[PDB]
Every structure is written in C-alpha cells, then in structure tokens.
Amino acid sequence: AQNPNCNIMIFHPTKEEFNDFDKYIAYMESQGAHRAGLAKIIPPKEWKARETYDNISEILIATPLQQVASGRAGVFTQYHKKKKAMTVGEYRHLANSKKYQTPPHQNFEDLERKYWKNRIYNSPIYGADISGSLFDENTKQWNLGHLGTIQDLLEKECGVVIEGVNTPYLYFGMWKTTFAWHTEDMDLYSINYLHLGEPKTWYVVPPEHGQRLERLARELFPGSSRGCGAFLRHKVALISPTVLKENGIPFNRITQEAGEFMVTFPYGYHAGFNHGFNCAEAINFATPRWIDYGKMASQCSCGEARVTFSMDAFVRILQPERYDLWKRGQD
Ligand SMILES: O=C(O)CNC(=O)C(=O)O
Ligand SMILES: [Mg+2]
Ligand code: NI
Ligand SMILES: [Zn+2]
C-alpha cells in the first residue's frame, strides 16, 4: 500500500502533466496521496492563473463575516456575525490595520503558536464563500472555473442525469481567519488555489481515521453532539493540534503559500487559518472513487447546516433513504 503513514504529499507536475486534470488526480492517488486527506500541488513554473492581480479591489464582499469564538484556547466554537458590505480594497485596508494585522513573528511555527494561544481573544473578519473566479478565461490548465462538473461525473458513473450546477468560490482572509473542522459536502473532494497574499495553514485527519476525530468532537462538544448526529457539518468547531496530540488523533499539518494548490480528498477532515490578507479560490469536484464516499456521507438533519441547491440531487440519488429526513432539515 502506498503512503501507509498517511503523510501529506507534495507534487511538482510538469507542464505536460498539467494538461489532464483527472489523469493527474488519479496519478496522485496511485502514489497514495489520498491517504493523508490533503495534498499540495505546485504548478509548473510556466503556468499562471492570470496576468496580474492589479484590478481586484472593486470585487464586493456583500456579507463579510466576523468570526467570534467561544470556549478555551484549544477547544472552541466560532459563530459568524454578519457585517456591512465592503469592497476587496476596503477589506485589504482593514486586514492591514493595526487592530487586525499579522503580529511580528519569527517564522511560520512561531505564528502558529501565536494563533493557538491567542485566536479566541480576537474576532477577525472573513470574506468567505463569494461565488466567482479569478482564473483568466484563457488559462486552460487547472482552471477551477472549467472543471468537469460533479453532476456530469455522477451521470457518467451512474447513468442518471440530474439538475444542479458546480461553480467556484472566493475567500478573502486576514490574520486569524479560521476554517473549522469539516469534510466537504457529500464528502466530495475540494481543490483550493491561493491566488495571492499571505499563507494558509492546514490541518488534516487521514480519511481512514475520520471517525476518531468525530468521537473526540462528540466528547469535546457534548451539547452540540446531542443536538445533531453530524454537527461537524455546521462548520463551527475548532480543536488545536496540541489537543489532538493529547487525545491520540492522527493528523498532519502543512502551510500553503500563494501560487500553490491544495486538494482535499473524500472524507478528509480539515481545519486551518490564514496568516494575513489573502485570496483563495476553491471548488468541489468528484472522481469515480468518490461515489462510494458520497453514498455513505453523514448528514446534518437538525437544520443548521443548510447547503446548496445542488446537494439535493446528490442526496436524492445516492442516499434515497436519508432523503426525506434531510430535506425536512433543509425546509
Ligand atoms: O480556505 C478556506 O477558508 C476553506 N477552504 C476549504 O475548506 C477547502 O478548500 O476545502
Ligand atoms: Mg475589481
Ligand atoms: Ni473544505
Ligand atoms: Zn445539524
């Protein structure tokens, strides 16, 4: 078995290898990359997502989210308080202000220490989940707005045609903005490109060990666990690496820099934080190997997780027994 310790793998495709996205994903999996839950892909040196980022400041962040924490420094939840709209230029200036900017630090490890020590005492503002793309239409390789759609994959594998669309999302971050522990909707893959700015640190649990993380989360968030049988679908819980190590949960960590792709694999729980002002683009995707994970994906039916239009069909076709109750949650 390839990559039996489930280490995060880093790939350096050539420009020729960068042509066929599906083929490269399948290659990475042939080498065991999925066992980690997460892989990094460094694009060939010839490639670019677009010519410059000089003209992005007038993008609107219609609903910036203030991420307010509750709990202890290594075990907390976050809720999102909606703020008034602002442009990307306004948000950048905010991120760089004395109240929100990255503190002085020695290196990524020192910054990571400061994040876990101090995150809960601040409420950074995240421009998350903004439909759109920063890839130039002329970028033909690994263009996250031109990928094969999940509905087309389901149709090719299973023969059933379904409604729904699959488009990318932009994320504008600042120091301490945080993504809570989660897998993707329907335990899909994700791909994330860091277009510009400061790094993003990731933590990930190997898919084969995801249930160990779930069991710890039920112990650490006991009221949330009684409320919902899949409360990590709410995307609000944080657990630090120190706490994970204390409880024997297998995980790995890596820092993504501008110009790099990350791929998350089906049922790879991940969480992380931004180092400073940045912009990422991400989308879900599927492969033939996903289908069996999609059929088994947990679901939130308490009603909190409330998700896209296109997830309906995935539940309806892959999880017909659950359908009924899940749609009661969504309505
Ligand atoms: O970058 C972020 O805030 C969150 N991204 C992801 O969870 C992803 O790409 O799967
Ligand atoms: Mg603009
Ligand atoms: Ni994700
Ligand atoms: Zn729920």
Q: Could you give the dihedral angle defined by the CA atoms of residues 94, 105, 198 and 76, in that order, rounded to the nearest 10 degrees?
A: -70
CA 59 to centroid of ligand 2, rounded, Å: 5
Total domains present in the chain: 1
Residue-number span of the structural domain to which 10 is assigned: 1-331
State how far the Cα of 183 lies from the Cα of 217, in Å rounded to an integer.
13
Query: Is 256 touching ligand 1 by the criterion CB < 6 Å?
Result: no
Q: Whose Cα sits closest to atom 10 in ligand 1?
A: 190
CA nearest neighbour of 38 among 179, 192, 167: 192
Which atom of ligand 1 is the closest one to the Cα of 178? 3
Query: Is 192 touching ligand 1 by the criterion CB < 6 Å?
Result: yes
CA 235 to centroid of ligand 3, rounded, Å: 9
**Residue reference for tokens 């919902």:** 228
Q: Domain holding 147: CATH number? A: 2.60.120.650
What residues are paired with 266 via a beta bridge?
none
Tell me the one-letter amino acid at 179.
F
State how far the Cα of 201 lies from the Cα of 5, in Å rounded to an integer.
21
Strands 278-285 and 60-61: unpaired
Which atom of ligand 1 is the closest one to the Cα of 262? 9
Tell me the one-letter amino acid at 289.
R
CA 182 to centroid of ligand 3, rounded, Å: 6
Ramachandran bin of 142, using left for φ above 0, alpha for ψ from -120 to 50, beta for the remaining angles: left
The first and second tokens of residue 191, run together, are 């791909």
State how far the Cα of 321 lies from the Cα of 30, in Å rounded to an integer.
33
Query: Is 264 touching ligand 1 by the criterion CB < 6 Å?
Result: yes
The first and second tokens of residue 214, run together, are 């779930």
Tell me the one-letter amino acid at 113.
R
State how far the Cα of 111 lies from the Cα of 270, in Å rounded to an integer.
19
State how far the Cα of 85 lies from the Cα of 63, in Å rounded to an integer.
5
Please check whether residue 153 is in contact with residue 288, taking contact to mean a CB–CB distance below 8 angstroms.
yes
Ramachandran bin of 71, using left for φ above 0, alpha for ψ from -120 to 50, beta for the remaining angles: left
Query: Is 299 touching ligand 1 by the criterion CB < 6 Å?
Result: no
Burial of 235 (0-12, 13-18, 19+ CB in 10 A): middle
Q: Identify the sign of the CA torsion 204, 209, 210, 215.
A: negative
State how far the Cα of 327 lies from the Cα of 331, in Å rounded to an integer.
6
List the determination method. Answer: X-ray
Burial of 104 (0-12, 13-18, 19+ CB in 10 A): exposed
CA 109 to centroid of ligand 4, rounded, Å: 34
CA nearest neighbour of 210 among 239, 182, 241: 182
Please check whether residue 206 is in contact with residue 35, taking contact to mean a CB–CB distance below 8 angstroms.
yes
Please tell me the chain's helix, strand, coil percentages from 3-state DSSP, rounded to the nearest 5.
30, 25, 45
**80 has binding-site annotation:** no
Mutate to test the pocket of ligand 1, among 126, 144, 179, 200 (most ligand atoms within 8 A of CB): 179
Cα radius of gyration (the chain): 19
Query: Is 190 touching ligand 1 by the criterion CB < 6 Å?
Result: yes
Q: Closest ligand to 89 CA?
A: 2
Strands 178-182 and 189-197: unpaired
Query: Is 171 touching ligand 1 by the criterion CB < 6 Å?
Result: yes
Mutate to test the pocket of ligand 1, among 192, 200, 263, 267 (most ligand atoms within 8 A of CB): 192
What residues are paired with 126 via a beta bridge?
65
- Alpha helices (H) in the chain, listed in sequence order: 21-30, 88-95, 108-118, 150-158, 210-220, 222-227, 241-246, 290-296, 311-318, 320-330
The first and second tokens of residue 310, run together, are 């296109």
State how far the Cα of 75 lies from the Cα of 73, in Å rounded to an integer.
6
Q: Is 308 helix (H, G, I), strand (E, B) or coil?
A: coil
Which atom of ligand 1 is the closest one to the Cα of 200? 1
Please check whether residue 111 is in contact with residue 119, taking contact to mean a CB–CB distance below 8 angstroms.
no
State how far the Cα of 223 lies from the Cα of 214, in Å rounded to an integer.
14
* DSSP label of 141: S
Q: How many residues does the chain have?
A: 331
Please check whether residue 12 is in contact with residue 236, taking contact to mean a CB–CB distance below 8 angstroms.
no
Q: Is 130 helix (H, G, I), strand (E, B) or coil?
A: strand
CA 225 to centroid of ligand 4, rounded, Å: 9
Strands 237-239 and 278-285: unpaired
Strands 9-11 and 38-41: parallel
**182 has binding-site annotation:** yes
Q: Whose Cα sits closest to atom 4 in ligand 1?
A: 179
Query: Is 282 touching ligand 1 by the criterion CB < 6 Å?
Result: yes
